[PDB]
Design a binder for this molecule. Sequence first.
Ligand SMILES: NCCCC[C@H](NC(=O)[C@@H]1Cc2ccccc2CN1C(=O)CCC(=O)c1ccccc1)C(=O)NCC(c1ccccc1)c1ccccc1
Lengths: 233, 290, 336, 215, 53
Amino acid sequence: DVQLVESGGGLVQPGGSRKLSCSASGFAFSSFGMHWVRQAPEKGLEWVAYISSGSGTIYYADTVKGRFTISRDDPKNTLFLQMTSLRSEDTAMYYCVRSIYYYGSSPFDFWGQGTTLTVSSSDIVMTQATSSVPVTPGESVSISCRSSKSLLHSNGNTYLYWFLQRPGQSPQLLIYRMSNLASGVPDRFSGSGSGTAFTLTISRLEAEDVGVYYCMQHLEYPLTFGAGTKLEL
Amino acid sequence: DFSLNFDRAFLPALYSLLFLLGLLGNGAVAAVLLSRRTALSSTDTFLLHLAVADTLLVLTLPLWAVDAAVQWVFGSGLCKVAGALFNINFYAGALLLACISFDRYLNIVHATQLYRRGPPARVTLTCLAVWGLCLLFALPDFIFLSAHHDERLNATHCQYNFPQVGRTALRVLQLVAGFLLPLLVMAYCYAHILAVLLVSRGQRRLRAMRLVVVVVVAFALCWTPYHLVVLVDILMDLGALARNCGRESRVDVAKSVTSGLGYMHCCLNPLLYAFVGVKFRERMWMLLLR
Amino acid sequence: DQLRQEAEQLKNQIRDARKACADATLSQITNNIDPVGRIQMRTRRTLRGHLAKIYAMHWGTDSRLLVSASQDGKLIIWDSYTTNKVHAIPLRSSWVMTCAYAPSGNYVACGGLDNICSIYNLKTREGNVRVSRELAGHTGYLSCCRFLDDNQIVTSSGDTTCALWDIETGQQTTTFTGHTGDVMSLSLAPDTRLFVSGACDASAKLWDVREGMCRQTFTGHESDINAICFFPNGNAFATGSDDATCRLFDLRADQELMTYSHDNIICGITSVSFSKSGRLLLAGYDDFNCNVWDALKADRAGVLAGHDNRVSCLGVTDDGMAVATGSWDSFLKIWN
Amino acid sequence: TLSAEERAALERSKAIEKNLKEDGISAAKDVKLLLLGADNSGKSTIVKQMKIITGIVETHFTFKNLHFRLFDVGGQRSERKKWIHCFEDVTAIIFCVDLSDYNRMHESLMLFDSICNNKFFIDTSIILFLNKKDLFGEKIKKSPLTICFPEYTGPNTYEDAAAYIQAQFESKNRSPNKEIYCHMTCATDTNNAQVIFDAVTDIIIANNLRGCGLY
Amino acid sequence: IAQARKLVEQLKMEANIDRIKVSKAAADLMAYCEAHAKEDPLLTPVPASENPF
Ligand SMILES: NCCCC[C@H](NC(=O)[C@@H]1Cc2ccccc2CN1C(=O)CCC(=O)c1ccccc1)C(=O)NCC(c1ccccc1)c1ccccc1
């Protein structure tokens, strides 16, 4: 089965350096672009870096540009992140994510288990109005998030992604462009929107749908996430 | 005045005929080669570039015919442009013939070491190198060529104002890079091609041998008469002979006639390298049907 | 001995009934229909990247993705709009004469002189295309492939027989027999309940996929049939042959409605296809051209002058917005 | 290619194109030869360097900086006309004949005429192999070469009989620009790869003469 | 002696078909290609704004 395991986290002093390793096993690692996504303690997801397939293209977030460098070792099927000077704002759980880009693909399907890092002591803005939404099983729900620019492109594709994070587990992809159900997810989920207003609606809510929902834009780098909406049972 | 009258009465018609026939042939070759939707073989690319060079060289001819007729009446700028085009195209033609000979030698002699399963063996690098070297050689024409107003004949012609040493050096470069090196490369390559063909087995080798001999003989016969007279002129200039008016007129007339033959060679190029191959004739038929 | 006479008289009875139905030719009923004019179609895309000769090609049901099989052992999936190469699948054997694209778009099929139909799964969790199943049982080369569902494919072989497979189990569910020569092509009816096949015995027959029976047989060609296509409404089909002619048959009438022969055509047809409406009939010949016929009046309405070699395959999108043709020159061109 | 996801799709396409180009280069030094002949004709034991790899069988021996691929099409049991064009671009046709099978001689002769005069093979040379000399020399003494060829008029010696057999096969050419490289091979003849290599060298040179414009 | 037993059987099955006049069959073909004539981009050129190619 597809498996991504990360290691290298722990406790480090300010100004030091550490290296994170993400080893893939169970898929054509040479054919998948890889991302680094970090989640500060009970804050939310944030995109860090991206390295293409073959290492041709590399991107970094403005926050970590220069300090971080991302490298890929195809023969060994490992993904590396070398962090040079770490501030107290770099403490977070770092996730290893895979992305394959071709017509009609799902570029954020699988997420790594994550590794915790602790340090001792222009862009498109996406907003989720509500932070919590109490609900009981069997009741329909709706979650919406806006954006600054219109995510609809000349291609006719709306570049927006919906992820669900369960308590204690890594985020999972649900809808990858605007309404396409990710493989393996139940058909009860649905997605809709137009330009700058989008909504995710869940019908016949179950006990396994409790978590935090993030809306992300893949129109142009740097990728940006939403604040996150939590479902309370 | 005999040489001047002979030029006036001879050059116009010959150059007009050369222009017409060279256009009608080389342009046809270029069009037939450019009609190809699929890739082009190495020799096809070299032949295309040779056709372009010959087309330009013949295109510049009528201006020179007018110059011979009365005088230059286009100013010094067109003098420089025409001279640069002429020399660039002449050197390009010579080096492209040499490159064709080398490609044939590689494809025939070393047939088993260069075998390819029908891919496009791109050769544009050598074409670019040839054109750049030609521009490098023509540079002095850009720098020096002008339109002097002779006070002895009251004429105005596109001539070099080089020093005598410079004129001799340019003549030597012409001889070396236009005749000796291409001739030696062609001779070596085609002699080896003949040697390989004599020991081959087939019914298509006879025409190949005859074509190779015809090509070598055509190049030699067409170009040697002018270069030999050029060597005679160099010997005269360097003091190896005695100068006189009669010898001057004879040299001028011989240069005119031999240059006419040399340009007739570029006129004939399509008949030798293009229209004799079965592939090119089949392509010509297909295009004409279209 | 007596059965032979019984066979001959049965053929005479069929011919007698077939002649009785004929009252007026197709060209005699559609004489007052105004022509379609000159159909001028200009190339819009030129998909290059194939090395050897292209022998087959199929359109995805979404009218955007393409699949092409070449003799160099590569099966390339193209993005028609942007000319991007979505996939490139190496083949075990480079001798391939057919390829098919599943209606759902999840699978693709391939086959050829190896006598095996290979099925490749495109939507894999590993991100690479893997050979899901290899179907064997034909004793001769494979001519055509066509998907019925995600788990049902119809194949044609040079064994003089067709087959219907169950991809899951991999066994041969049904076998269609009756041809006396190599089967060169087949086309599935729009409702995927009947299909026709053209063989080298200069005949075509209509087969009931559910019943495994030859419902009807159609003759008239002077040579082997090379291509076949159903009419869009499923009540007629067209056939291409080495006879340098195309013919239109009608299932209900059980005859030949019209012929598409021209005195200037000397070569055979390699592919045949219809338009979305069913008025144009596009065929690819060995003279490096495709001729567009006014299927209702049999008049050359245009020519797709392209490619430097024989046109081996044709295709029209499910939305009818383009026509793709492949040739032995290793180039695919999309026309509009 | 404006969108971020469209740019990555373009990147993937360029990666595929590079791999396709690389595969073509690695398959450029391969000479494709077609094996033909009747059954029990020795078409499976020409070169002892087999390294093989129902349907189509391939053999991919390499010799003198050149990769030779032999394709055997036996077992198709179909009409040749419909798959023969698949081999239109083969470098040459290797035709095998058994001199010890009188009853199978006529079938081989019909095969040679059909293959030699096929519209697709109007330019592909043929490398004809006449196998099993020793058996032919032993069989001729007991049975004269008259039953198989009633028109034979020459002596009953090995040299003449072999020459007459070769002449008959060569008489089916009936076309120019196509040459037949006939050779006599025995069971214990290791230098069969050499014969194909030098014969292929002549074929390659002739093809280049056409492309280079010297013919 | 047994191969042709099924051949005659097939012809009997194929000979008993409720056929219809070619006039009706030909007219049906004409009607369909006329009804679905406005939805055929190839038969009539489509405006350049709606053409994906
Ligand atoms: N006495 C006055 C003429 C002295 C030059 C002599 N002109 C001719 O002979 C005929 C007949 C003739 C009659 C009287 C007056 C003019 C001409 C011009 N000629 C032409 O056709 C054109 C030549 C030309 O104006 C030219 C060419 C290239 C660059 C610049 C100018 C000649 O040598 N021309 C060919 C020669 C060469 C030309 C110029 C400089 C050096 C050499 C050459 C060049 C390249 C390759 C091979 C030969």
